[PDB]
Amino acid sequence: MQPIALSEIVSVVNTSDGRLEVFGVGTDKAVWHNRQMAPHTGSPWSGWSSLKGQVTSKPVVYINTDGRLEVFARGTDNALWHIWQTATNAGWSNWQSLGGVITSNPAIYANTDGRLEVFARGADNALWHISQTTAHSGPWSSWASLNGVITSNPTVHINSDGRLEVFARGTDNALWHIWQTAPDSNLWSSWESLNGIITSDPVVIDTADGRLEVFARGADNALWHIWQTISHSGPWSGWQSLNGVITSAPAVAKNCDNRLEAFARGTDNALWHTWQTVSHSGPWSSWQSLNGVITSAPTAVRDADGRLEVFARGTDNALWLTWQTASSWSPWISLGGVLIDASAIK
Amino acid sequence: MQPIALSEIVSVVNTSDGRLEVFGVGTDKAVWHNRQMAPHTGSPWSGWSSLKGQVTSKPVVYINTDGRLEVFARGTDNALWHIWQTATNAGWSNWQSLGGVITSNPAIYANTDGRLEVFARGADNALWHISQTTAHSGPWSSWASLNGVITSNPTVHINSDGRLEVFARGTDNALWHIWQTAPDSNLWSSWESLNGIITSDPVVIDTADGRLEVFARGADNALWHIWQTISHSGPWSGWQSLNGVITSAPAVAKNCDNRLEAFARGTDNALWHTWQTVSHSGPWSSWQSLNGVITSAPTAVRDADGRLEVFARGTDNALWLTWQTASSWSPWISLGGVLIDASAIK
Ligand SMILES: OC[C@H]1O[C@@H](O)[C@H](O)[C@@H](O)[C@H]1O
Ligand SMILES: OC[C@H]1O[C@@H](O)[C@H](O)[C@@H](O)[C@H]1O
Ligand SMILES: OC[C@H]1O[C@@H](O)[C@H](O)[C@@H](O)[C@H]1O
Ligand SMILES: OC[C@H]1O[C@@H](O)[C@H](O)[C@@H](O)[C@H]1O
Ligand SMILES: OC[C@H]1O[C@@H](O)[C@H](O)[C@@H](O)[C@H]1O
Ligand SMILES: OC[C@H]1O[C@@H](O)[C@H](O)[C@@H](O)[C@H]1O
Ligand SMILES: [Cl-]
Ligand SMILES: [Cl-]
Ligand SMILES: [Cl-]
Ligand SMILES: [Cl-]
Ligand SMILES: [Cl-]
Ligand SMILES: [Cl-]
Ligand SMILES: [Cl-]
Ligand SMILES: [Cl-]
Ligand SMILES: [Mg+2]
Ligand SMILES: [Mg+2]
Secondary structure, eight states, X not given: OOOOOXXXXXXXXXXXXXXXXXXXXXXXXXXXXXXXXXXXTTOOBOOOEEOOOOBSSOOEEEEOTTXXXXXXXEBTTSOEEEEEBSSTTSOBOOOEEOOOOOOSOOEEEEOTTSOEEEEEXXXXXXXXXXXXXXXXXXXXXXXXXXXXXXXXOXXXXXXXXXXXXXXXXXXXXXXXXXXXXSTTSSOBOOOEEOOOOBSSOOEEEEOTTSOEEEEEEBTTSOEEEEEEEETTEEEEOOOEEOOOOBSSOOEEEEOTTOOEEEEEEBXXXXXXXXXXXXXXXXXBOOOEEOOOXXXXXXXXXXXXXSOEEEEEEBTTSOEEEEEBOSSSBOOOEXXXXXXXXXXXXX | OOOOOOOBSOEEEEOTTXXXXXXXXXXXXXXXXXXXXSSSTTOOBOOOXXXXXXXXXXXXXXXXXXXXXXXXXXXXXXXXXXXXXXXXXXXXXXXXXXXXOOOSOOEEEEOTTSOEEEEEEOTTSOEEEEEEEETTEEEEOOOEEEEOOBSSOOEEEEOTTSOEEEEEEBTTSOEEEEXXXXXXXXXXXXXXXXXXXXXXXXXXXXXXXXXXXXXXXXXXXXXXXXXXXXXXXXXXXXXXXXXXXXXXXXXXXXXXXXXXXXXXXBTTSSEEEXXXXXXTTSOBOOXXXXXXXXXSXXXXXXXXXXXXXXXXXXXXXXXXXXXXXSSSBOOOEEOOOOOOOOXXXX
């Protein structure tokens, strides 16, 4: 490679053959990726290679329901572009334009019928969407708006009953959401407020008991969360603080026992974390340090051995990596590269 | 409730809200079920209640891609019948016939497009299939044959690239298989032999690195296995023994770190098990005893806390249950009921 709260520097996925693979942007605006040779914690890595392209957003990988990876990014023309594996353990297509004019990172999820649907902000700050017309396949539909006025990147997650739901910060800095009223459809609710005051993009997970749960940095730079009180349904809970003082977006992942764990940069620029204790319904630990000096939010993912691995940019712009060991966490190691923050909303 | 190697006595699922739920048959041939109140190991259970019906196969539950449970069973007329939740956290439809004449338990899997496809043996011992025409929905297609001559219940599993693949014992007692050549299609291979000599139904998993792997009791009543050597592809490995002397079908589940674990009844009628050590690519432990006196194969499943829970019938015909603890395994507890072995092939 050539020499809102702060964003994640990469998009990551645990692939259909149990390998972690990360996607980032270099100084000349190409998308690069790096992947484990082997499905295990501490595997050697491929090194960075270029998928080319010229991007003005975070590149966002999603796995099709046939296992083919696909990467979505905004182009220098502000259209949505994508590139995909032509077969599950094979090479990549060329970049192709899906048109439109977008003003955020793209957010992607599979409908229950295997059709990817992509969400992105438009020039008037409304939310727009486009989708595959058949399972993991073009042609794509035409773009349409779900309205709203949003001031963060959008985040999408499917409910435990198959209904897509999108979250985003509003002009007032509250968290807003909107949802399919039926799976696989274009029947959507009105936008509704979940109040609060957020200063990062929202991070969304579906818990082990089927409740959507949203994490976000608050006005006070603590980590807050809120959730559906019953499976795939409102009413929502109150906003609740998980404390901390954080200087980047939060990342959240599930341990293999479904204990949630949140990661974020601290006031000392180290990686900090907090996790549920004992089980997925337990209380949260105090924030604790994983050291390092990082220049992006962290990106967390669970690997094929069931361990959380966390990636973050260093002061040198290389991507570094630390992972859970039986005892503790490993010392940071460098994967090299020279990565830039290409987020469409900063 | 009213007062090949041996089969499993129940079908089990970890539901979309993290609850285990089991389905069995009573003396009067109705399908009954029992489920955890709460998404945790050692949760209280509902007790047994009847979904009615009159069945002559194991009832087999599958979770639609919108989270609705659906149960498939052969009727006393030898047709395939089914019943489904009308909404993800709600009640059940009535039993409805999908017609045909079948001579095995049904085997079910979701295509990459969300369409359930059901496989079952016919009156000439060929394999037949029928499917939903749209994602998690009727109407259903008409029945069609994939030929072959089979002498065990069939087992289906999707490859890590979205291709369905069906396994079954042949007239010669070898393991045979057949596969989609493309996802979501009716384009299937010829039947092909994987040789060996098997004396149970095949049990199939997809490993953490995307390889199908099949377990079966051998001629010598040891547990054998065989696998794809690369992700979603032949060539297959040699048959390899995991030893043991087993008096029921094997059940296999993944620990939350992806270590495979096999369970089966022993010569002393206790539950025995063997597991991969250290990680998902590790070697297998020696067989060890979990006690009990059981009158069916075990049924294994991983719960919402990431623990394996194992169910088996007792000498009294109640369903008993034991689960992993931090240290060890819990003492057997009774869930009651009076369950019969209704398997269409014994
Ligand atoms: O040509 C449009 C492309 O759309 C992608 O989303 C799909 O994964 C590709 O297979 C191709 O159809
Ligand atoms: O808060 C009310 C709404 O909550 C949403 O999260 C849910 O998807 C809707 O179906 C409705 O329940
Ligand atoms: O460093 C201490 C902590 O590390 C976390 O990742 C893990 O979830 C906790 O169980 C505890 O081990
Ligand atoms: O009426 C046919 C039924 O087929 C089931 O497989 C489906 O889950 C039901 O919703 C219903 O369509
Ligand atoms: O053994 C040869 C075959 O093995 C199957 O398991 C696989 O699904 C096929 O695509 C082909 O590779
Ligand atoms: O009883 C001893 C064994 O129990 C198994 O279920 C588990 O996979 C092993 O890790 C070991 O604990
Ligand atoms: Cl570059
Ligand atoms: Cl707009
Ligand atoms: Cl999630
Ligand atoms: Cl930068
Ligand atoms: Cl009964
Ligand atoms: Cl037939
Ligand atoms: Cl599996
Ligand atoms: Cl019986
Ligand atoms: Mg994977
Ligand atoms: Mg579940």
